[PDB]
Amino acid sequence: TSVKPIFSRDMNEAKRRVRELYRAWYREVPNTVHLFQLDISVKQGRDKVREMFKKNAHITDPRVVDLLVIKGKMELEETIKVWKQRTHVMRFFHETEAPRPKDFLSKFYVGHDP
């Protein structure tokens, strides 16, 4: 592997960097719930964040984790400020979309092998 990294070196500065920005998002859940005038319960906004970080824990490599940092670092520009007009935030909460079957027999009635 002959390529320079982005920020980290090996497995330790990376896995303290990802723990840094989690304390930003944990602080900046109960701000946007009134900064956009959106009416839900505040514990919903904290459940989505602790859901989202456990998704990517299958990585065995540096600078891939560092790539996800840059996306995670960027969103705190728009979210902590007011650049999303109430609608780009609420797309994480799929309220409209109908539930998927996800079990074998219910797929077999409706749909040609999804």
Partner 1 sequence: TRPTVRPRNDVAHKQLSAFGEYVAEILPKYVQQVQVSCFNELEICIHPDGVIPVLTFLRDHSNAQFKSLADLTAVDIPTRQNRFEIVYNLLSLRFNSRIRVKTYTDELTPIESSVPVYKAANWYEREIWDMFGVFFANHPDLRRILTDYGFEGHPFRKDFPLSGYVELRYDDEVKRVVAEPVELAQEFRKFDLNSPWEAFPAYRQPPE
Partner 2 sequence: IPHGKGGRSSVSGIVATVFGATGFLGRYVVNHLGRMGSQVIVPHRCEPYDTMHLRPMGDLGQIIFMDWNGRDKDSIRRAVEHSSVVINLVGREWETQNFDFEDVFVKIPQAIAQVSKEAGVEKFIHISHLNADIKSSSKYLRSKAVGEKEVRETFPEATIIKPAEIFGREDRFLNYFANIRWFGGVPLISLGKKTVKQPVYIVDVTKGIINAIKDPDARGKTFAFVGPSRYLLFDLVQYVFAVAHRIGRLFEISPFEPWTTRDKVERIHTTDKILPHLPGLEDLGVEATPLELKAIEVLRRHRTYRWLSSEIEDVQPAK
Partner 3 sequence: EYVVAKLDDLINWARRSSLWPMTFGLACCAVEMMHMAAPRYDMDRFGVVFRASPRQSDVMIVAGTLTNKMAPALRKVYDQMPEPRYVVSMGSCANGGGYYHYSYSVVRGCDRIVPVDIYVPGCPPTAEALLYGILQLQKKIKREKRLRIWYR
Binding residues vs partner 2 (CB under 8 A): 34, 37, 39, 41, 97-98, 110-111, 114
Name residue, tokens 């079990």: 103
By CB under 8 A, tell whether 70 contacts partner 1.
yes
Q: Which is nearer to partner 3, 6 or 38 (CB)?
A: 38
Q: Give residues with Cβ within 8 angstroms of 7, minimum separation 6.
A: 13, 14, 17, 66, 69
Residues 82-111 touching partner 1, rule: CB under 8 A, are: 83-84, 87-88, 90-91, 95-97
By CB under 8 A, tell whether 76 contacts partner 1.
no
Residue 62 CA to residue 13 CA, distance in Å, equals 10
DSSP 44: H
Distances (CA, A) of 10 to 3, 16, 63: 13, 11, 9
Token reading at 9: 């070196």
Question: According to CB under 8 A, which one of 87, 104, 112, 114 is a site residue for partner 3?
Answer: 87
Partner from partner 1, partner 2, partner 3, none binding residue 11, C-beta < 5-8 Å depending on class: none
By CB under 8 A, tell whether 96 contacts partner 3.
no
